[PDB]
Structure formats: structure tokens, C-alpha cells
Amino acid sequence: MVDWELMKKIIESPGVSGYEHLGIRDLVVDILKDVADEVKIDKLGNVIAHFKGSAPKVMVAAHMDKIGLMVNHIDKDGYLRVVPIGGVLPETLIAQKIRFFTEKGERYGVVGVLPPHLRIDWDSIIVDVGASSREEAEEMGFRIGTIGEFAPNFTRLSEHRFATPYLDDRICLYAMIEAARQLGEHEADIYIVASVQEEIGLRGARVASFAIDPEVGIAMDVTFAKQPNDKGKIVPELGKGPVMDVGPNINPKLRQFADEVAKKYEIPLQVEPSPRPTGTDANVMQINREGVATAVLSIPIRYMHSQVELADARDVDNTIKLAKALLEELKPMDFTP
Amino acid sequence: MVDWELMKKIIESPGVSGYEHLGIRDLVVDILKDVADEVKIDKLGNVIAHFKGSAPKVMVAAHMDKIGLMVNHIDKDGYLRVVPIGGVLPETLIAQKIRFFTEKGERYGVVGVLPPHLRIDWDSIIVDVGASSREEAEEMGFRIGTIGEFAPNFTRLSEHRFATPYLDDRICLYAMIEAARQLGEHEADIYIVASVQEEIGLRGARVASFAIDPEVGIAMDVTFAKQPNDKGKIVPELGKGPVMDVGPNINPKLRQFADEVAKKYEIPLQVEPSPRPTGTDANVMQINREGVATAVLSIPIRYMHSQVELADARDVDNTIKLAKALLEELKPMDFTP
Amino acid sequence: MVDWELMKKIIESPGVSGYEHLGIRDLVVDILKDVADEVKIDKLGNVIAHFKGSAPKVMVAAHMDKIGLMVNHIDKDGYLRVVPIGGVLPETLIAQKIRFFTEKGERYGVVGVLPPHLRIDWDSIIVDVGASSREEAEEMGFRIGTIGEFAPNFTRLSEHRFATPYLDDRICLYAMIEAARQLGEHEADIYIVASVQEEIGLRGARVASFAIDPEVGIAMDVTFAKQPNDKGKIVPELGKGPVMDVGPNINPKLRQFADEVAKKYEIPLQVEPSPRPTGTDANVMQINREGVATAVLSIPIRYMHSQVELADARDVDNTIKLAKALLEELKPMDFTP
Ligand SMILES: [Cl-]
Ligand SMILES: [Cl-]
Ligand SMILES: [Cl-]
Ligand SMILES: [Co+2]
Ligand SMILES: [Co+2]
Ligand SMILES: [Co+2]
Ligand SMILES: [Gd]
Ligand SMILES: [Gd]
Ligand SMILES: [Gd]
Ligand SMILES: [Gd]
Ligand SMILES: [Gd]
Ligand SMILES: [Gd]
Ligand SMILES: [Gd]
Ligand SMILES: [Gd]
Ligand SMILES: [Gd]
Ligand SMILES: [Gd]
Ligand SMILES: [Gd]
Ligand SMILES: [Zn+2]
Ligand SMILES: [Zn+2]
Ligand SMILES: [Zn+2]
């Protein structure tokens, strides 16, 4: 079962990389304070929630930062110029609405388009916030350094599928949190991390990893799903279950284990071939300290890093189940390759 | 004064070129039936509302059709392919939501984007409606020929400025209708037309023009407003008043008259230099039958033909006033150049 | 006040990345041994100077390595081929003098130009050291691995502005050093680090960060200043004060504090929008161990990484004042974002 209302709330709560404290951080803390033995916030802004247990020591990470924008200029006529935080594609900004977090509250701006008869790149991205002068714009609360996000826009397309900005990674943050709320008996000593600044170099998990010092590390990010024009170069598909990579970033014995957990609980599990260190928190967890046994558990989505990221609710539900089952079944074990 | 609620309603009511009967037509008829002597709908779908009077015979036209999309393909996996109705730019479709009018009601779809590592044109525009098969998509109500529009999204940015799809031409349809509701005493014999199929060749006004046979014809469309990257090649500016073109499509004595009406009522009036026959209903009105004395009265907007068209409410209000004043002050006159 | 003689000396002292021991290290050790409680040199060459105090533990880093050149070949005719250590532009080498540190003392070389009628790249970079044969060059003290720098050339242009190779980062090393010298009572437990190998991966601040384990970290590097042909994309300006970034790498609470310090001491303070993890020592400090509260304090300069790096003495003076003031005002406080 999926809680649509809570999911929507977690997806749309403010928090670009480096600015997770604008909303999502407190929302996450307020949900986990009730179920975790202890909840802390570190100097980088990570939310670390301890679910006390015996062994092994297990870290789970789902990043709460969104890709977004920073204002770096305001011109005489009151237009804004912006620059990306994280892998924003400028092509997805044309004729779109941007949600800004100014000092007088949330405001909106609009990225225009040039009518054909007066005619891809970041210098063409000029934000219109409804002002006539630099002074009016400043008075609205706009500053050099003001942060913006894709305007919220949640759409259920069918019974199962839905499109919204920022499924990466709010969809896995939601699944991770949900699995934690339902967490039953477990031998493992579990740390649930809502990591910070993942979209700009995995920095949150790097630092939380150092603090916690786990034996097992599991990252919950989204992954690419088969979509139009992918040239058939994408293995996972929407609606066919959660995904767990295989490859160098993936500890073989941990990956084997998760497979059998899935078999026992009869949860469909997809394979994603990953020949490189992943672009997830598992990358830096694996090379933390003396080494960590790591894996990636992901929800497949279409249209990664756009206002229109699309998932299947059956994959979300199954991801919650497998996350829960894994955390409960995890026991001391030989992870040596 | 501007009625934000009514404006929003008129802007968002369904009606692409050739399909104004999906909503906007009845909305317009229902508003004008109360104030007009007689309201008719012609074979092309035009709404013609007569406000009886003496002379001259005056036609006013604001088009109620929107640019939009038609589905022309549904593939095995349930994706849609679409083609434009009117001057839709494909660049404005990336990561956008489309509102569809299917046979089982309104549904939504989403135009994806291709993640960078697997890489402007219409064959790249594939619509995702949350289906898995052609059959599921058909069952949803999708057909070859299903119509779609930009998803509604009204945003007031500041006290005066607001951005939304389809200000062209719902913003002038609203101003025109509003002026008609407030219409006082007038010597002129007035026909208020909500024209059809303007974005694909001015066809509605061509035909309504023939039926009515006016001596004076006035078109209310939107026009380009000064915006970023316009190379300073746009004269009108947001917030500096309604616009009335000057040029070959504009009868000199009618244009003179409107100028003095504006002076008397002290409504700011901008000039737009138009050396060609205009891309408005005034084009075909002027060459109707034995000739018609024509002018263009427009509201300036930024970002023409995108989801993010932007206007200034002060221009809207002033447009209502000048439209009203002109209709009341209009009297028999020598229009001979 | 700025000490021109001391500033010049610190700027022109030898020390390319990995070879900071050729001069700058001892000059730094010699100056701070007089004011610091303790001075150590680590395995990579960082100079770490302890200024005892209570809390918080504060690391300040100004890098003492310069970008430079390494000889990787000597041909039969005694010419050298070189390769860059750090972000050297080959364009800045045409018709320039190079200072080399040979086994027989400092020597000079020249990178030529080809007269046009005989006609951008590293293969066009051939150094002429005045030799006729490989042996003569060898006998002169030149080896594969010989290190070279931009020849020193300090010039005061006006009362406040001056241009020289290697303001990056000797100008902030100088500022940090002066601030330490003038340091009064302070609650913070202060470590002044003159770091090693910054222009090639922030190595050194990475290791010093680890040994010191601070709670607060401040980098003093140079930053870009508004200059000709910058497309107006550079916010900070010469003469308008020190600069402090805002963005993910900058702890919001520390940044707010520093702002407050500036206001109280009436020191002009600029903002630089930095949406990425910075290209300064603060990048690795932030992700050191369990995380650090970090900021960047920088001097604005023109023509970064060239022989004519150019600064304003008023910004230097103010950077010292702000550096001093910050270190004295710093106290325990909650840095949680
Ligand atoms: Cl990721
Ligand atoms: Cl038009
Ligand atoms: Cl640097
Ligand atoms: Co991402
Ligand atoms: Co149009
Ligand atoms: Co540098
Ligand atoms: Gd550019
Ligand atoms: Gd104010
Ligand atoms: Gd079963
Ligand atoms: Gd250890
Ligand atoms: Gd094509
Ligand atoms: Gd059916
Ligand atoms: Gd007046
Ligand atoms: Gd006639
Ligand atoms: Gd080469
Ligand atoms: Gd002086
Ligand atoms: Gd520690
Ligand atoms: Zn992610
Ligand atoms: Zn139009
Ligand atoms: Zn530097």
C-alpha cells in the first residue's frame, strides 16, 4: 500500500542541494522522531536516525536534496539570471515555472521563450518574476543567491503511473521512511540517513558514512527506466519491480542475500548492469574507511532530472516491502567476496 | 477593474481551433445571451452576438480558438504521437503536461525528455499517458484525432503581472466580453463576434464577416511586448497601455478617431508599426466584400504562443475601457482615406 | 595598512605544487614562529601553526603552491619541452620568461614565438635556455623534472592597484599571515594552515583537515573580478571589499555570522553566487571526517592564472581586517543549518 498524501508532501517539500533545511529536513525529522531511538542532524545537514540493534551495523541512504537553481544576477528591468545546482538541463526550462525561496516567502518566476521571428543554452535562460526594475525585484525579496526549484506539479496519469518533478530522490526518501515506520523485529543495528548534497558529488553520505562507520551500506536512489528513444540501452522497466544493480560497486554476497530475501517474500526484483561506480550514495559508502559492503536499491523512473519524472506505484510499494524485509532479515554474515 | 475569476475561467475553458465547441463556445454564449439582443452560432462555430443600434455597422472580433495538438498515432506500448494545430513550437513541449479531451473525459499526458547519456523537432515529441499498451490507451479513451492543449497553469507573479498559457486570445476575448457587459448607450449597430479558427488562417472571421457585412471591423488579438532578447525590435511594452497598430491594414480615419477617443477618456494608447497585413481577424475583415474600415486593438504580451504568456492587468483594464468608449462614441463618419 | 615589501616577498618566494619546500614553506615558518604557540610541518609539506584557544576549533587555509611547469625533455640542441603543473594556459606562455630551479641554482628560460612567414598548443611550447646542446643544458643544471615558474615581475600601477604573477594565492597567504600576526584575544582554538598542492586537487588541505579535525573551516583563496569581456558574468569587483561566497559549500550560519562581523566593523563585503562545491580548500574541508562548517573568504583579482594577475590594495587591507575580526569574534554557536 502507498500513502499518496504523504508521498506528495515529501516530494514537494523545499530543499535544493545545500538547502535541505528549507523544509524537507524538518519534515523528515518530524516523521522519524516517533519511531527511531535517536535522531540527529550533523554539521552538513544530514538527518541520521538510529534504530538500535545488535549486528551488523547497517547504513541506509536516500538523498533529500533536489537539483535546482541559484539566482546570480538581477538586471535593471528586474529580470533574473540563474545558474544550475546539480544536473539541470536548460532544455527543460523553456516556458516553465520556477518556485523561488526569497526572504519574504515563496515567489514564482517564469522562463520565457523567444517568438520565432526574432531568432539550447544557459545565457538564453532569463527569469521573469513580474517586476519592472531591479529595485522592485529586490523589494520582492530576490537576492543574488536566491534558490529556485521546478514548480510543483503532481499528476496521476493512470491508476498506477504518475509524473512530477523531483521523484529523484523524494520517491525513495518516501519509500525509505515508510519502510522505517513499518520496521518490525530486526537483529541488525540500523542507521537511516536522509542524505544531503547528493546531486553535487555525494557529499552528505560521504560524511555521514564516516560518522556512522557501517559494515553494510545501502543506497536508495532512482534509476533509469525503459522509455522512448533509449535505443534499447536501458534494462529496467516501469512496473516490473524494484531494481538492484550488479557490478563492482555491488558486494556479491550482499547482492546474493537480497536476491534470496526477494525470493522468500516473493517481491519482483530487476537487475541493472552497472560496470562503473554508481552515481549514488553507495559510491562513497563503499570506499568509506576500511571498506563497506554496499548495494543499490532503486525505483525505476522515466525522464530523469525533468519536471516530468514518471514512476509506477507498484514499484514503489514493492520497494517499501523489500527494504523492510531486507532490514529485518539482515544478520551477521561473511561479506568477503 | 478586472474580474480575475472570470478571466481565469475564460482562459482555461477548452477550445482548440476547430474545436471551440468543447467548452469556450457555450461559456461565451451563456455570458452574452443576457446582454445582447440576439445570439447565434454559425455553421463554422462562430458566436455572433447582436447589440442593436443605428449606424455604422460595426463588427468586433476576438478569437476563441487556442493553438493545440492532435493525436495522430498510438504505438504498441501505449505512447502517443502528436502533431500541431496552429503555431505550436516543439521546444515548448519538452517536460510539459498536456491536457487531452478524450471520449471518456479529460485526461493528462506528459512529454518526456531523453536523459543526456543517450543522445528541436516533432519526431522527438512522444506523449506518455501512463498506459502500457495501445489497448490500454484506447480504453482510456484515446483516439487517432484526440485533441490536446497546454495543461492549465495560471500564475499571478506580482500585483499586476500574470503568466498562463493561452492569453492569445482568451485575454482579449475576456476584455471584449467585459466591455460588452458594460456597454452603455451607443448609436452604432454592433456585432460582437467570438471568432473561430483564427490560429489556422483567420477562417472564422472571414465567414462571419461575410454574414454580418460591416462598415467598421475591429480585431482584438494579443501582440508582442518588449521582452528579453528581442533585439529591441518590439515597440509595445507591458503596462504602458493597449496597442493600436498603424499601417496598411489600419484605416487612417478610424485610427485617428480611436486616438481622440483615447485622449478624451485619457486612456494610454501605444502605437505598433505594422507594414504588412496583420496576423489577426482584421486581415480578412478588411478585404471582406466591398471593403471594410478596419483597426487592431490589442493587449501586449510576452512569450507569445507558449505556456508562459505574460500580461499586465493595467493593460487589460485599459483595453476594456477603450473598447467600451470606442463602441459608444462611434458614429456615422467618412472613412474614405 | 598593507606592507608592500612583505607582500612582494611572499608573492615571489619559490613554491610550485609539490615543491613548496623550495622557498615559501620556510618563509612562512619563519614569520609565524614568532606569533604562534606552535608550528609543525606534515608529511605533505603543509605548514600548520597553532594559536591556542578554547572553542570552536577553527582551520584557516591559504594555499602556498603556485601553478608552474616541469621539464619533461631536452633535445639535441638544448631546448626544453615542458608540461603544466596546475591550470597553466599555453596562451600565457608566448614570448614569456621562465624562472627555473636547477641543481646549480636559479636559471632563466624563454618561450619563443615563430615569425609569421614561417607558419595555442603545448607542442608549440619550447623553452630556450641559451644552450647549444643537450650536454650544455645538462651541465647548466637542467634535468627531466626541473621545475619552473612565471618569472617574477611585480608592478604597482596606481596608488591601489598592482599586477604580478601569482596573486593566487600568495596575496591571501599574505593576508592570512598579517591577520594572524595582529591577532588579539580570541575564544576560538585557531589553526592557521598554509596548504600544499591546492592547484592540483586540494590535496594537503585534505590531509591537514584530517589531522586537525576542526569544527569550522575557512579558505582564503582569490576569486574572479569583473574585467573586460567577462560578458557581465562576474559579480565581485576590485575596490569593493573582500568576497564571501554563498551556496552549498558555505554553511549558512557561519556565513550569516561573518556578515554580522563585517557590519559591526564596517567592512565592505561582497557576495559571490557559487552553486557548485568550490575550487578552493573549503571544498575538501567541508567533507572532512564527520563534516565541517565552512566558508570562503577571498580577494577579488583580474586575469586569474596569468603573469598579470591584478588586485586592489584596499581589498587586501579590508580582507585582513575582516579576517582578524572574524577570528577574534568567533565563539561556540550552533552551526546546524
Ligand atoms: Cl543520483
Ligand atoms: Cl493572432
Ligand atoms: Cl584556487
Ligand atoms: Co540525480
Ligand atoms: Co496566435
Ligand atoms: Co588557482
Ligand atoms: Gd554561455
Ligand atoms: Gd523595503
Ligand atoms: Gd507464494
Ligand atoms: Gd576502524
Ligand atoms: Gd521529421
Ligand atoms: Gd471497453
Ligand atoms: Gd483629466
Ligand atoms: Gd453589398
Ligand atoms: Gd599535442
Ligand atoms: Gd598612500
Ligand atoms: Gd571523530
Ligand atoms: Zn539521485
Ligand atoms: Zn491571436
Ligand atoms: Zn587558488
Numbering used by the authors:
A (entry chain C), B (entry chain C), C (entry chain A): 1 to 119, 129 to 346
Task: Give sentences copied directly from the paper behind this entry.
TETs monomers are all formed by a proteolytic domain and a PDZ-like oligomerization domain.
To unambiguously characterize PfTET3, we determined its crystal structure by SAD at 2.5 Å resolution. The asymmetric unit contains three monomers forming one apex of the PfTET3 tetrahedron. By applying the crystal symmetry operators, PfTET3 dodecamer is reconstituted. M1 is coordinated by residues His314, Asp177, Glu208 and two water molecules, while M2 is coordinated by Asp177, Asp230, His63 and a chloride ion. By looking to the preferred coordination number of Co2+ and Zn2+, it appears that Co2+ adopts preferentially an octahedral geometry (coordination number of 6), while Zn2+ is often found in a tetrahedral coordination (coordination number 4).
